[PDB]
Each structure stands twice: as structure tokens, then as C-alpha cells.
């Protein structure tokens, strides 16, 4: 379990999670991301939070939800 299906379907590594609703400074993973633990570790290696966002590309600010169990 990486991201849910539907709206919040794209794993990104974002510098900040604002309001539990917005990812700021969002990077694409540079690896395939197979599990929650890999997602978490990969984003932490980039100083970032694993968020599940509405689009799959790098961006300034996106609507996102935290990855599960974070
Ligand atoms: Mn920025």
C-alpha cells in the first residue's frame, strides 16, 4: 500500500504538508515505489514527506493526503 486509488493516487515526495491537505515542493520518486516503508524511506532520504497527490508530476503545490500510517 503506496497510495489509494482515485483522487489521491500519485506518490510524491514533498517538502511540506500544509494543513494535512497540501503538498509543497513536490518531487517525483527517483525509484519505483513498491511499499509504504520504501515510500517513507525514499522521501525521507530527500528531506521530504511521502504524500499521495492529485497529479503525478513535480510541482510547486498540490492537493495531497499523507501516506497511510504517517
Ligand atoms: Mn516552492
Curated annotation (Swiss-Prot):
UniProt induction comment: By C and N starvation, and by light.
Cellular compartments annotated: Secreted; Spore wall; Secreted, Cell wall
Disruption of the gene: reported phenotype: Leads to wettable and fluffy colonies. Results in thinner hyphae and impairs the formation of aerial hyphae.
Sorted UniProt keywords: Cell wall, Conidiation, Disulfide bond, Secreted, Signal, Sporulation
Main location: secreted
Gene Ontology CC annotations of this record: extracellular region; spore wall
Disulfide bonds, paired cysteine numbers: 3-52, 13-43, 14-26, 53-64
Family, similarity comment: Belongs to the cerato-ulmin hydrophobin family.
Quaternary structure note: Homodimer. Homodimers further self-assemble to form highly ordered films at water-air interfaces through intermolecular interactions.
Function summary: Aerial growth, conidiation, and dispersal of filamentous fungi in the environment rely upon a capability of their secreting small amphipathic proteins called hydrophobins (HPBs) with low sequence identity. Class I can self-assemble into an outermost layer of rodlet bundles on aerial cell surfaces, conferring cellular hydrophobicity that supports fungal growth, development and dispersal; whereas Class II form highly ordered films at water-air interfaces through intermolecular interactions but contribute nothing to the rodlet structure.
Name of protein: Class II hydrophobin 2
Provenance organism: Hypocrea jecorina (Trichoderma reesei)
Amino acid at each position: 500500500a503506496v497510495c489509494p486509488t482515485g483522487l489521491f493516487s500519485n506518490p510524491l515526495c514533498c517538502a511540506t504538508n500544509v494543513l494535512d491537505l497540501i503538498g509543497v515542493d513536490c518531487k517525483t520518486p527517483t525509484i519505483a515505489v513498491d511499499t509504504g516503508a520504501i515510500f517513507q524511506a525514499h522521501c525521507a532520504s530527500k528531506g521530504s514527506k511521502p504524500l499521495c497527490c492529485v497529479a503525478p508530476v513535480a510541482d510547486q503545490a498540490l492537493l495531497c493526503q499523507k501516506a497511510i500510517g504517517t
